[PDB]
Ligand binder design. Structure first.
Ligand code: WQJ
Length: 165
């Protein structure tokens, strides 16, 4: 199972880890991708997860978008986890660098409640531009299922743990 996680609440855990390396080690039922509405996995967590699948995640995602159209900001879709997990839950957090409503971050985290346990990044953090301390607060106040957060950046991980209320 998951190892080396610091317990933050009854259901939220956190670790300084590369989510691709974490997924390969664990092979969780669900890995969360920090997706955009088009499922274009170019950079950040999405680019790293997609690159780990040898682009199979992007090919599957383009077929999904061709059939269904784009996701909503705050929405999600369940696709294959390829070599990383049983499933990938592609969740769209608001991208602050696109003027997207930061209030949609709570809606985005609500998608996690449809899964009993997940390996996930902090939504809207990184290249999405939101404050990761705020994202962690919304995560613990919204997600009721068991979430194992992987924070790539060690300095950000330390800041998140040391400032956690
Ligand atoms: N937060 C976060 C967790 N893991 C990863 C990243 C970000 C980006 O590089 C790939 C692995």
């Amino acid at each position: 199972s998951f190892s080396g996680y610091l317990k933050l609440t009854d259901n939220v855990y956190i670790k300084n880890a590369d989510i691709v390396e974490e997924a390969k080690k664990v092979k969780p039922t669900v890995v969360v991708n920090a997706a955009n509405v088009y499922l274009k996995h170019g950079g950040g967590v999405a680019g790293a997860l997609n690159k780990a699948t040898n682009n199979a995640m992007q090919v599957e995602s383009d077929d999904y978008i061709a059939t269904n159209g784009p996701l909503k900001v705050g929405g999600s879709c369940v696709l294959s986890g390829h070599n990383l997990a049983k499933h990938c839950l592609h969740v769209v957090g608001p991208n602050v660098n696109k003027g997207e409503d930061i209030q949609l971050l709570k809606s985005a985290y609500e998608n996690f409640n449809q899964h009993e346990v997940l390996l996930a990044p902090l939504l809207s953090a990184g290249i999405f531009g939101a404050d990761p301390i705020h994202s962690l607060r919304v995560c613990v106040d919204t997600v009721r299922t068991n979430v194992y957060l992987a924070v790539f950046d060690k300095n950000l991980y330390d800041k998140l743990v040391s400032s956690f209320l």
